[PDB]
Design a protein around this motif. Structure first.
Motif, mmCIF file in Angstrom:
data_model
loop_
_atom_site.group_PDB
_atom_site.id
_atom_site.type_symbol
_atom_site.label_atom_id
_atom_site.label_comp_id
_atom_site.label_asym_id
_atom_site.label_seq_id
_atom_site.Cartn_x
_atom_site.Cartn_y
_atom_site.Cartn_z
ATOM 1 N N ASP A 236 -0.167 52.204 -65.475
ATOM 2 C CA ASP A 236 0.838 51.499 -64.723
ATOM 3 C C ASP A 236 0.830 49.962 -65.358
ATOM 4 O O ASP A 236 1.220 48.446 -66.200
ATOM 5 N N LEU A 237 0.068 49.181 -64.207
ATOM 6 C CA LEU A 237 -0.680 47.958 -64.076
ATOM 7 C C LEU A 237 -1.314 47.695 -65.306
ATOM 8 O O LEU A 237 -1.012 46.286 -65.733
ATOM 9 N N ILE A 238 -2.075 48.305 -66.043
ATOM 10 C CA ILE A 238 -2.868 48.066 -67.052
ATOM 11 C C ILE A 238 -2.008 47.832 -68.456
ATOM 12 O O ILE A 238 -1.969 46.675 -68.837
ATOM 13 N N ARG A 239 -0.978 48.488 -68.264
ATOM 14 C CA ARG A 239 0.410 48.541 -69.519
ATOM 15 C C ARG A 239 0.772 47.253 -69.514
ATOM 16 O O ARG A 239 1.408 46.494 -70.723
ATOM 17 N N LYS A 240 1.489 47.005 -68.449
ATOM 18 C CA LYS A 240 2.267 45.760 -68.076
ATOM 19 C C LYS A 240 1.084 44.665 -68.070
ATOM 20 O O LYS A 240 1.583 43.214 -68.843
ATOM 21 N N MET A 241 -0.199 44.413 -68.115
ATOM 22 C CA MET A 241 -1.125 43.635 -67.966
ATOM 23 C C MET A 241 -1.245 43.288 -69.626
ATOM 24 O O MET A 241 -1.458 42.288 -70.083
ATOM 25 N N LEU A 242 -2.016 44.324 -70.474
ATOM 26 C CA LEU A 242 -1.123 44.132 -71.711
ATOM 27 C C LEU A 242 -0.499 44.485 -72.933
ATOM 28 O O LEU A 242 -0.459 44.849 -73.622
ATOM 29 N N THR A 243 0.653 44.158 -71.813
ATOM 30 C CA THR A 243 2.218 43.378 -73.087
ATOM 31 C C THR A 243 1.526 42.873 -73.713
ATOM 32 O O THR A 243 1.126 42.139 -73.461
ATOM 33 N N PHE A 244 2.030 42.820 -75.446
ATOM 34 C CA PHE A 244 1.959 41.904 -76.345
ATOM 35 C C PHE A 244 2.443 40.870 -75.896
ATOM 36 O O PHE A 244 1.794 40.205 -76.282
ATOM 37 N N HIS A 245 3.569 40.826 -75.955
ATOM 38 C CA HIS A 245 4.360 39.144 -75.505
ATOM 39 C C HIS A 245 4.038 39.083 -74.166
ATOM 40 O O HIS A 245 4.346 39.143 -73.417
ATOM 41 N N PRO A 246 3.713 38.075 -74.432
ATOM 42 C CA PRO A 246 3.182 37.186 -73.388
ATOM 43 C C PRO A 246 4.451 36.970 -71.913
ATOM 44 O O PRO A 246 4.795 36.592 -71.206
ATOM 45 N N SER A 247 5.427 36.517 -73.247
ATOM 46 C CA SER A 247 6.853 35.870 -72.121
ATOM 47 C C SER A 247 6.914 37.537 -71.023
ATOM 48 O O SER A 247 7.999 37.540 -70.255
ATOM 49 N N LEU A 248 6.975 38.742 -72.297
ATOM 50 C CA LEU A 248 7.532 40.033 -71.409
ATOM 51 C C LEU A 248 6.021 40.448 -71.111
ATOM 52 O O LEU A 248 6.296 41.700 -69.670
ATOM 53 N N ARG A 249 4.943 39.392 -71.138
ATOM 54 C CA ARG A 249 4.176 39.863 -69.467
ATOM 55 C C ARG A 249 4.341 40.102 -67.812
ATOM 56 O O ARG A 249 5.017 39.255 -68.503
ATOM 57 N N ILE A 250 3.165 40.587 -67.500
ATOM 58 C CA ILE A 250 3.741 40.323 -65.926
ATOM 59 C C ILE A 250 2.735 38.841 -65.730
ATOM 60 O O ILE A 250 1.813 38.717 -65.829
ATOM 61 N N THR A 251 3.522 38.726 -64.167
ATOM 62 C CA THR A 251 2.978 37.212 -63.961
ATOM 63 C C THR A 251 1.738 37.929 -62.758
ATOM 64 O O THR A 251 1.303 38.659 -63.013
ATOM 65 N N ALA A 252 0.780 36.893 -62.533
ATOM 66 C CA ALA A 252 -0.869 37.389 -61.460
ATOM 67 C C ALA A 252 0.344 37.704 -60.085
ATOM 68 O O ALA A 252 -0.459 38.209 -59.271
ATOM 69 N N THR A 253 1.810 36.877 -59.573
ATOM 70 C CA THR A 253 1.842 37.117 -58.668
ATOM 71 C C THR A 253 2.046 39.268 -58.415
ATOM 72 O O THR A 253 2.264 39.526 -57.829
ATOM 73 N N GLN A 254 3.206 39.051 -59.470
ATOM 74 C CA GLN A 254 3.492 40.719 -60.256
ATOM 75 C C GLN A 254 1.980 41.473 -59.812
ATOM 76 O O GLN A 254 2.349 43.099 -59.810
ATOM 77 N N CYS A 255 0.985 40.839 -60.335
ATOM 78 C CA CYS A 255 0.122 42.035 -60.358
ATOM 79 C C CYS A 255 -0.793 42.266 -58.467
ATOM 80 O O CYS A 255 -0.778 43.217 -58.441
ATOM 81 N N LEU A 256 -0.351 40.983 -58.614
ATOM 82 C CA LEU A 256 -0.911 40.917 -56.864
ATOM 83 C C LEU A 256 -0.440 41.935 -55.475
ATOM 84 O O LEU A 256 -0.717 42.243 -55.125
ATOM 85 N N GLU A 257 0.943 42.125 -56.389
ATOM 86 C CA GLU A 257 2.040 43.358 -55.597
ATOM 87 C C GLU A 257 2.536 44.196 -56.454
ATOM 88 O O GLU A 257 3.127 44.770 -55.519
ATOM 89 N N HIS A 258 1.350 44.696 -56.874
ATOM 90 C CA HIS A 258 1.566 46.066 -58.248
ATOM 91 C C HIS A 258 1.943 46.833 -56.805
ATOM 92 O O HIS A 258 0.241 47.139 -56.675
ATOM 93 N N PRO A 259 2.189 48.037 -56.886
ATOM 94 C CA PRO A 259 1.266 49.014 -55.893
ATOM 95 C C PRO A 259 0.513 50.097 -56.167
ATOM 96 O O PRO A 259 0.056 50.487 -55.046
ATOM 97 N N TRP A 260 -0.252 49.614 -56.660
ATOM 98 C CA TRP A 260 -1.549 50.168 -57.238
ATOM 99 C C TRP A 260 -2.408 49.428 -56.010
ATOM 100 O O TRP A 260 -3.133 49.919 -55.838
ATOM 101 N N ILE A 261 -2.324 47.805 -56.108
ATOM 102 C CA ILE A 261 -3.088 47.011 -55.907
ATOM 103 C C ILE A 261 -2.683 47.050 -54.159
ATOM 104 O O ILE A 261 -3.546 47.226 -52.805
ATOM 105 N N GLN A 262 -0.990 47.133 -53.590
ATOM 106 C CA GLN A 262 -1.128 47.920 -52.243
ATOM 107 C C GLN A 262 -1.604 49.282 -51.545
ATOM 108 O O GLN A 262 -1.995 49.254 -50.505
ATOM 109 N N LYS A 263 -2.148 50.246 -52.384
ATOM 110 C CA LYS A 263 -2.293 51.171 -52.182
ATOM 111 C C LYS A 263 -4.038 51.475 -51.456
ATOM 112 O O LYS A 263 -4.193 52.223 -50.306
ATOM 113 N N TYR A 264 -4.800 50.403 -51.570
ATOM 114 C CA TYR A 264 -5.762 49.924 -52.046
ATOM 115 C C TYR A 264 -6.357 48.681 -50.579
ATOM 116 O O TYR A 264 -7.495 48.559 -50.620
ATOM 117 N N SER A 265 -5.042 48.388 -49.762
ATOM 118 C CA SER A 265 -5.439 47.249 -49.739
ATOM 119 C C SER A 265 -4.663 47.623 -48.121
ATOM 120 O O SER A 265 -5.206 48.164 -47.405
#
Length: 265
Positions: A236-265
């Motif tokens: 899911d994380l990778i999908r949001k980060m490799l979103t084609f259109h930059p405007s539809l792509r997730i921000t860096a803060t949204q990466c830092l706060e993705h459920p996947w990052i929180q599970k291993y922190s």
């Protein structure tokens, strides 16, 4: 000898190795005796003919401070070149990829979270890396630091075959079409993340051209057996980060706060 402000303040200890911008040197301060990693950059590599504009960008970078961002201490001048005085540090995340081949979701999450923390902080200050690669992330125990953050807008890099293929894997589609904003750093981090987990580029090819054609289409797959037992959250994380259109792509803060990052922190 008409030496510059650099030679009076520093004298080289040894060569550290060729970098993306020129030679990288280990230098000692002549007064304080502390050691620094200095990037010698030919003045012809300057992207802006107005030097003062470049000195201003760097000045803004000198004021910045983040645990996951390599510190830029000062910029000095010769008749021929610029000298970027930064942090001395000891290997690249690239070398670790070769060694481990793949990373567990836990180990990958800890590494890339730090990458996100750095990106987030720089993006808050409108500073885009543009050339995020594992070669630009340093590690040893656990700590990661991103180097040359923001320098690519000031200075032109090496563009030999080796340079171009490396750049090709991580470059966002917009950057090829001729524009960039902060979102190109999230794309690049997404590619890195994809590699950490699979040991394989999302966009692949035997040459520069072939890689760039796949990037251009933006099409990639989680089809390799290696992906079969990786979590939906990571994908899911990778999908949001490799979103084609930059405007539809997730921000860096949204990466830092993705459920996947929180599970291993």
């Amino acid at each position: 000898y008409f030496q510059g402000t650099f030679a009076e303040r520093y004298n080289i200890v040894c060569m550290l190795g060729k970098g993306s911008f020129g030679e990288v040197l280990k230098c000692k301060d002549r007064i304080t005796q502390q050691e620094y990693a200095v990037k010698v950059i030919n003045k012809a590599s300057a992207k802006n003919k107005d030097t003062s504009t470049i000195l201003r960008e760097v000045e803004l970078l000198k004021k910045l401070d983040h645990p996951n961002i390599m510190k830029l201490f000062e910029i000095l001048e010769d008749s021929s070149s610029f000298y970027i005085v930064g942090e001395l540090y000891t290997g690249e995340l690239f070398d670790e990829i070769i060694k481990r081949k793949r990373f567990s979701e836990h180990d990958a999450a800890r590494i890339i979270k730090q990458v996100f923390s750095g990106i987030t902080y720089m993006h808050k200050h409108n500073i885009v890396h543009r050339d995020l690669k594992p070669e630009n992330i340093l590690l040893k125990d656990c700590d990661i630091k991103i180097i040359d953050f923001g320098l690519s807008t000031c200075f032109q890099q090496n563009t030999k075959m080796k340079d171009r293929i490396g750049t090709a894997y991580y470059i966002a589609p917009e950057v090829l079409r001729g524009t960039y904003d902060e979102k190109c750093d999230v794309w690049s981090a997404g590619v890195i993340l994809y590699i950490l987990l699979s040991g394989t580029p999302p966009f692949y090819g035997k040459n520069e051209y072939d890689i760039l054609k796949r990037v251009e289409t933006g099409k990639y797959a989680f089809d390799l057996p290696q992906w079969r037992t990786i979590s939906d959250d990571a994908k899911d994380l990778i999908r949001k980060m490799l979103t084609f259109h930059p405007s539809l792509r997730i921000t860096a803060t949204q990466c830092l706060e993705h459920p996947w990052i929180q599970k291993y922190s």
